[PDB]
Amino acid sequence: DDYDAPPTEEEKAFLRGLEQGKVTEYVPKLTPDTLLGYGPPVATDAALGKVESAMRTMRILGGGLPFNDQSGVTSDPTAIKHRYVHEKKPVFFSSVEEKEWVRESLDKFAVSEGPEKKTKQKILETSVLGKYEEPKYVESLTETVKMVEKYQGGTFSYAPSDADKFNKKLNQLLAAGLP
Amino acid sequence: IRELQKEFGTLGLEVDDEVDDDRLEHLAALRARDKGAPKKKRTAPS
Amino acid sequence: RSRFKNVRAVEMGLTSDAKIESFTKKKFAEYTEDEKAALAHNYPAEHMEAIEAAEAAIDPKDLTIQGRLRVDPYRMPYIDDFSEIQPIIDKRARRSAPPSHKARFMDVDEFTQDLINWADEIRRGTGPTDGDILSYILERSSMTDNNLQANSSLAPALPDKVPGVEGKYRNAIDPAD
Amino acid sequence: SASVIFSKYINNNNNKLIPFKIKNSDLGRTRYFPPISKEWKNSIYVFNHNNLKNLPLFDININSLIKDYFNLQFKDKILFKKKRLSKVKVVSLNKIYASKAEIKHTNTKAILTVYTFNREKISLYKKIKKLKKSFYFVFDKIISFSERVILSGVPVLPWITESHVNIWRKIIIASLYKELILLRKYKLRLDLNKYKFEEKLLYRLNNLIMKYYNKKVEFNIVNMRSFLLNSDILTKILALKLKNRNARVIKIMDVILNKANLPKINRVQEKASLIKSVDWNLLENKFKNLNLSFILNDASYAERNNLSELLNKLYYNVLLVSQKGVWALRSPAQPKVSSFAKAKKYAKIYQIIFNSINYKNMGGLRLEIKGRLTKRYRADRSLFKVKWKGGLKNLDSSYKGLSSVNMRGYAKPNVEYSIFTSKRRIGAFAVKGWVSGK
Amino acid sequence: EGVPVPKREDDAKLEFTRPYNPGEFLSEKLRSDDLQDWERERYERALTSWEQTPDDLKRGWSTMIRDIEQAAAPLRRVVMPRRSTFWYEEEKDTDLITNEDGEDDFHENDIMSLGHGKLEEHREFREYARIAVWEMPLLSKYAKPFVPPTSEEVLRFRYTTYMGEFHPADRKVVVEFCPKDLRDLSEVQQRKLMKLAGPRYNPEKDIIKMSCEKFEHQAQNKRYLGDLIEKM
Amino acid sequence: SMFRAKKLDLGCFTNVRVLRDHSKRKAFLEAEPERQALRYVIRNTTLPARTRAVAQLQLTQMHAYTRPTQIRNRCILGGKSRGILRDFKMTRYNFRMNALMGNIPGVKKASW
Amino acid sequence: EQEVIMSRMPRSLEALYLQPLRREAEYGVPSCDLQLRSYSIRNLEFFCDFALRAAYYLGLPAFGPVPLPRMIERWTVPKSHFIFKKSQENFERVTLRRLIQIKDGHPETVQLWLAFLQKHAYYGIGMKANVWEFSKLGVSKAMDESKSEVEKLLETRWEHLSHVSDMKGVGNFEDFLAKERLRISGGR
RNA sequence: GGUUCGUUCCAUGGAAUUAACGUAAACCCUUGCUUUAUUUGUAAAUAUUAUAAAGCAGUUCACCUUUAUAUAGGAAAUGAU
Ligand SMILES: [K+]
Ligand SMILES: [Mg+2]
Ligand SMILES: [Mg+2]
Ligand SMILES: [Mg+2]
Ligand SMILES: [Mg+2]
């Protein structure tokens, strides 16, 4: 009633191609542009180190994911549309192919071509030009406010928002302890 | 798993949450033999 | 002051720098213009760019002063150009297009048209040969993605008779049972 | 001139010169270094260990996510299957069994390796083949026959637009509805089983796992031919079988062992030691002076100074049509490959690669079942059963006396241990399993 | 709310309940139940053409669908599980059930899971052997020769990298210079610089080493040391 | 009570005290800069005696969840707080089992 | 058409079966200190060689691999989850590390080396590189001048980042990077 | 019945032949040597401490003695090592 014939030799030879694989081509390609994105983000005089530290700042704004340009072009569109529109935060793409896949996967979704001018200056301001706020020298010890700002400006543990919480309570106490 | 059933639910694919399915089967088996939980009292005892 | 020792260089009779060159040009001679043409006729352009750069970078004097044979446990157990990607001994290739996010599984209406379209492609050379029917059950995409063959993450299978495994097992079950 | 700071690091030159010494002692061949990914599930090293403490917890969530992924199945309404909405808990064994994932970590991505035993394809592929070849042959005739009756006169042209095809396609469906659904059901169930290993569905699972490691995840799913070559898949199958109250415990273990084929061996030669003798065929003992200058300098043979000639006499070359022959190249879109890629024969290379691998053949099998596995629904004492077939020893070290590389400082490199926990209606039980390789 | 109740209010309604031929199908469709008038003319044209064909030319058609039914007959046959069955002991989905003969044989075409770790390791050695033979030589085309630092380059900065990792220590920048490199400072002015340097001066090596990790970015830590040295 | 989030945001082994200690880590992260200012005004002997007494009274009114001394590591797998290792966030026992099976990278049985 | 008897194979393929060639440093001033770390020796020893081969093509004279002292952590835990303390056992996590120091290396060239190694990184290995460079006085002035040089190189790279007009989710730019890096880096 | 650290090995039995676990082997540290590497370690250096990857090494040889002639053992700062 039921007798399935053995796999024919033409069938076997066909399954091997799918299972074992076939002889695919391979094209060598290696230029500084194919390595850009993986280099060291060091503040060297060499422009290659400064261009890499700006890309690292763009990856922190985009979510902080590593720079992967050899693992596909897929991503989560429903999560990128939310971040880009509902949260209004930047998005970092490893390649242009990954940007055109989010467009084709979402109905009527428009993404900007690069960041705005004001965002290009803020990235080069600190990550490349390294423009800081010099901590002044406070001579007297009674200058509480000036001394706190001096210390807060000489350590990356006090973020701009963490210092505001400190200076708020401080000024609240110094003002509440006067005649 | 709840986020896995929704990501693939748009394609018409379903999977069972065994960890929660047996939990319900246990609760259902308790009500059968009169061992379920009492009615939650929502007022002070008086 | 150099980096290596001359104990192994003065042993053969290479005391003079001029004699070291006679040992390179005689044994590590660069490719002849005839060989370059023949070597460039078989490999594509992108491959030849790496060969012309490897002979200009690797100077023959280094192969003579410090060129040693590799005996570490990480050397390859055979010689090969590694130009192409082989079926089994290499990782699976990924040369297909990305998948469509809006693609969905075909329905009775879309599945029929897909089946009709398949009958029109093979019928352009009688009737559907089992070789084509087999290429329809295992390759024809049943998603609304315009018949896209996507990259597969399945690892390459092994030969039908693994060296070291074949010729050691016997089937306990018999047909007479 | 030169800077003083630059001149303060030149004088600090007390480095030792490479001596190029000559070996006067015999060297034995190195041990078999097993793969690295088999010692720890996560092959990782990070300088900030904040990315290293949560991994033990994630892998519990990842494995729970890959299990539920390979069990995905269509809704019975999508395939017109008319589900029997019974209150039973059907135990399905003809599904994809997956093992615990093993991840290879780098600062850019993560390669997730999982060994699968696809038992659902063995059934689907058989039935889709049962459909006689006449189906597609006769179906092709309806296409041509229906184009001479409906889209023609009486007994693709410019006057045949697309709107007319819609009505032409429904007539075929109206008469073959009950059959087009049968073929569609088996094809969809097959393509689903096929896409679970392709990017059509993996790119969705990557988005879920990518939220744990914050890296794109690559998959290296390995398809297993038999379920006995992995301890994880073996203890899970046996656990699902024993979950039924009516399951004959002692009988289900014998059915599995009987399916485990072991290679015939010679008990005397297998347990025989190995005498330690200098292997003069090793490249370390052949050329004690490794420098090319000494070798190619007309040491023994004449006019073999060509480096390529020396290598061909040591390694198996594929570019050569003859093993030790010369390399001959032909003198003067399509894929970019070499003009001799087809001539290359990887016959002996498959024999060199697969002979350099240990623990290929299965030579050991042990199963242990412990817990509450009684039939009667009462308080009874625990049960314990153990069955084995073959040995779990390391023949290369226990008998031959060779040096092995234990895993995690104590484990044997050839055994695979896995435990699966389940529960009956009366209590919990576990299924332990060992699988060794020769 | 309350104890959950089952969900049996769902089913897939089959469009067609019985095999309809072109005549009967079009007749019911042309009944004008729910259809566009301008679309009906497309149907009547088909119904007339169908009836115009030789009557027995439908006999061939009706017999054509009957042979396809016979071709799909073995695909819907409920195979009874083997008496001593392992995989289909309690499989309620009759679709997957099959003969279950030979599905457990070992064709000597697979190795254990441990052997696959060593095989995948070789597929990786070939991937690096392919990079070292075809992609590495291209690096020589973009290399640049080393030039010794001139007399003006008197500073020697140090920058840390973790190669794709985020570490709090990759923001520190160290700088070291020699007081005697600054030829603009005289003897007394050089000795005063060793005093102001404080513990940053190494009398043995005669190098003023100083670091800075006060700011969030390496660029800021380097700019501060560049300005600080101008104050020193 | 008021610091417990209305929606559970814990993905590890949840527990009555694990959920309690997680709320103290979030409460302290928000109020640490504020608590550091009060501790700086109390130890600054250059400020008036009144400014130090005000900061000394406000630091006492802070909720207990704001204190860092209330934080105590717990096992993410078992929820215990006795015998924890900072390097793995687990008890000495849970570390043993996972290390033997290979779920903790780099760790192996030591013999010498 | 004919057949040419190739005298030898390409030097790129021959060099793969020889020990990694090394360039000679004329001065010997270190320009990079690459320290690799793994919990397994095999991965590390392989990649150390793959790195030296890439340094030869770039003209970078590499010195190593130098085996640095292995870092050993130790824990002694009871075998039981309860009273049984008289029986314990020792565990360890041995960190194996190497050092490849590059002397007399061009600053930019040394950055391509590290970029090539990160793109082709071997699993299970962590790397840390310290880069040294010589620069003139007036560091601040140089940084400002370079601006236009770096802007031209980023013209085509700005496409990676795209955001809506006047991104409000960021708010304070600097406070965002400061706290986003903390979340990305696990908390520190 | 002997022997061995040892159900180890030999011989033998008018009943044995074999398999798994433990044992043993192997593994980690340590000792001597060889090769590789020379920084952040080493005074110098033609390379010798240290660092750490792989490989070799023992009861091996010599001497003495030795059952049933089968299996072996003894000697311990004045044989080698
Ligand atoms: K700050
Ligand atoms: Mg009750
Ligand atoms: Mg006997
Ligand atoms: Mg030094
Ligand atoms: Mg030594």
Residues sharing a CB contact under 8 Å with residue E220, sequence separation 6 or more, in sequence order: A126, A130, A131, A132, E214
Q: How close is the nearest chain F Cα to the Cα of A97, in Å?
A: 34
Identify the closest residue of chain E to D32 by CA–CA distance.
Answer: E118
Q: Which of residues 92-121 of G touch strand H (CB under 7 A)?
A: 96-97, 99, 101
D130 CB closer than 7 A to any strand H atom: no
What letter represents residue D14's amino acid? N
CA-based nearest residue to A167, from A177, A156, A152? A152
C155 and D222: CB-CB below 8 Å?
yes
Tell me, in angstroms, the distance from the centre of ligand 1 to residue G170's CA: 18
State both tokens at E129: 């052997």
Taking contacts as CB-CB distances below 8 angstroms, the residues of chain E near A155 are 214
Residue among A43, A92, A41 at smallest CA distance from A69: A92
CA-based radius of gyration for chain A: 28
The CA distance from D186 to E76, in Å, is 11
Place of tokens 């067609």: E16
DSSP string covering chain A, please?
---PPPPPHHHHHHHHHHHT---B-------HHHHTTTS-----SSHHHHHHHHHHHHHHHHT-----SSS-S---HHHHHIIIIIS---EE-SSHHHHHHHHHHSTT----SS--HHHHHHHHHHHTS------PPP--SS-HHHHHHHHHTT-TTS-HHHHHHHHHHHHHHHHTT--
SS3 of residue G132 by DSSP: strand
Rg of chain G (C-alpha set): 24
Q: Check if the beta carbon of residue A89 is closer than 8 Å to that of residue A83.
A: yes
From the list A45, F22, D93, C175, the residue with the least C-alpha distance to G140 is: A45
What's chain F's length in residues? 112
Tell me phi and psi for residue D324, to 5 degrees.
-100, 5
Q: Transcribe C117-153 into DSSP letters.
A: HHHHHHS------HHHHHHHHSSS--BTTTS----B-
CA D161 from chain center: how many Å?
A: 50
E136 → closest Cβ in G53, G132, G184: G53
**How many CB atoms are closer than 10 A to CB D357?**
24
Q: Which helix (H) or strand (E) holds B33?
A: none
Residues of C in contact with B12 (CB under 8 A): 104-105
Residue D246 structure tokens: 């009516």
Q: Residue type at G161? A: L
- Helix H, strand E, coil C: the string for chain E is CCCCCCCCCCCCCCCCCCCCCHHHHHHHHCCCCCCCHHHHHHHHHHHHHHHHCCHHHHHHHHHHHHHHHHHCHHHCCCCCCCCCCCCCCCCCCCCCCCCCCCCCCCCCCCCCHHHHHHHHHHHHHHHHHHHHHHCHHHHHHCCCCCCCCCCCCCEEEEEEECCCCCCHHHHCEEEEECHHHCCCCCHHHHHHHHHHHHHHEECCCCEEEEEECCCCCHHHHHHHHHHHHHHC
Question: Nearest-CA neighbor of B16 among E92, D89, D203, D79?
Answer: D89
Peptide bond into G65 cis (omega under 30): yes
How close is the nearest chain B Cα to the Cα of D57, in Å? 16
Query: How far apart are the C-alpha atoms of A42 and C112, rounded to whole Å?
Result: 59
Q: Using CA atoms, how far apart are residues D313 and D300, in angstroms rounded to an integer?
A: 14
Give me the amino acid identity at C22: S
Helix then strand then coil, in percent of chain G rounded to 5, is 35, 30, 30
Q: What is the CA radius of gyration of chain D?
A: 32
Q: Which two tokens stand for residue D154?
A: 């009486």
Q: Which of A118, A53, D130, D143 is nearest to E78 (CA)?
A: D130
Q: Which residue has the tokens 């890296």?
A: D215
The candidate with the shortest Cα–Cα distance to F39, out of F61, F55, F57, is F55
Strand H footprint nucleotides (protein C-beta < 7 Å): 18-29, 33-47, 51-57
Closest CA-bearing residue to C1' of H47: D16
Cβ partners under 8 Å of residue F62, min gap 6:
F31, F35
Q: How far is CA F8 from CA D208, E111, F5, F13, F26, in A?
A: 19, 46, 6, 12, 13
Separation of D187 CA and H71 C1' (Å): 72
* Residue E3, token pair as written in the block: 């104890």
Tokens 């699972």 -> residue: D205
∠ at Cα E127 (E123, E132), nearest 5°?
145
DSSP character at residue C105: B
Tokens in use for D177? 């509805």
Cβ contacts of A135 on chain E, cutoff 8 Å: 214
Q: Torsions phi, psi of D420, nearest 5?
A: -125, 130
CA triple A23-D112-D73, angle to 5 deg? 90
G59: left (phi over 0), alpha (psi -120 to 50) or beta: left
Cβ proximity of F23 and F65 under 8 Å: yes
Which positions ≥6 away from D339 have C-beta within 8 Å?
C41, C42, C43, D329, D330
Contacts of F72 (CB under 8 A, 6+ apart): F21, F81
Contact present, E53 and D148 (Cβ < 8 Å) = no
User: How many Å apart are CA C13 and CA C10, to the nearest integer?
Assistant: 5
CA dihedral D212, D216, D218, D219 (to 10 degrees): 40
Q: How many other C-beta atoms can be found within 10 angstroms of the C-beta atom of residue D303?
A: 7
Strands F90-91 vs D222-223: parallel, antiparallel or unpaired: unpaired
> CA D321 → CA D310, D328, D341, distances in Å?
17, 8, 12
Q: Which helix (H) or strand (E) holds G130?
A: strand G126-135
What number of CA atoms fall less than 13 Å from residue C141's CA on the CB side?
Answer: 19
Determine which of F104, F107, F111 to mutate to test the interface with D (most D C-beta atoms within 10 Å).
F104
DSSP run (H or E) holding G176? helix G173-184
Angle at D78 between CA D72 and CA D81, to 5 degrees: 95
Query: Could you give the C-alpha distances from E164 to A36, A39, A53, D58, G181, in angstroms and in order?
Result: 13, 9, 12, 22, 13
Tokens in use for E198?
Answer: 């404080």
In contact, A30 and A36? CB cutoff 8 Å? no
Quote the CA–CA distance of D231 and D237 in Å, as a whole number.
Answer: 10
Residues 212-271 of chain D sitting with CB below 7 angstroms of strand H: 267
Alpha carbons G18 and D314: distance in angstroms, whole number? 13
Which chain G residues touch C39 with a CB distance below 8 Å? 6, 10
> Which among E79, D307, D38 has a CA at the least distance from the CA of A3?
E79
CA distances from C171 to C175, C176, D261, D438 (A): 10, 13, 8, 19
For B:9-38, CB contacts with E below 8 A are: 24, 28, 31
Picking from E74, E100, E75, the residue whose alpha carbon sits closest to that of residue E85 is E100
Task: Say what the alpha-carbon torsion angle D52, D53, D59, D62 is, to the nearest 10 degrees.
Answer: -80
Q: What distances in angstroms separate CA D196 from CA C153, D118, E163, G70, one per listed residue?
A: 9, 11, 34, 43
Asked if residues C65 and C19 have their Cβ atoms less than 8 Å apart, the reply is no
Experimental method: cryo-EM
Q: How far apart are CA D304 and CA D295, in angstroms?
A: 10
**Tokens encoding D220:** 């290296």
The tokens for D161 are 């637009």
Structure tokens at B11: 């394609």
Contact across the interface for C116 and D143, Cβ inside 8 Å: yes
Q: Could you check: is the Cβ of residue D294 within 7 Å of any atom of nucleic acid strand H? A: no
Neighbours of D155 (CB within 10 A): 9
For chain B, the residues whose C-beta falls within 8 A of a C-beta of chain D are 1, 3-4, 7-8, 12-17, 21, 25
Residues 13-32 of D with CB under 7 A from strand H: 14-21, 23-31
Nearest to A13 by CA among D227, D129, C130: C130
H helices within chain F, ranges in order? 16-43, 49-61, 92-101
Q: Compute the nearest-CA separation of F103 from chain G (Å).
A: 13
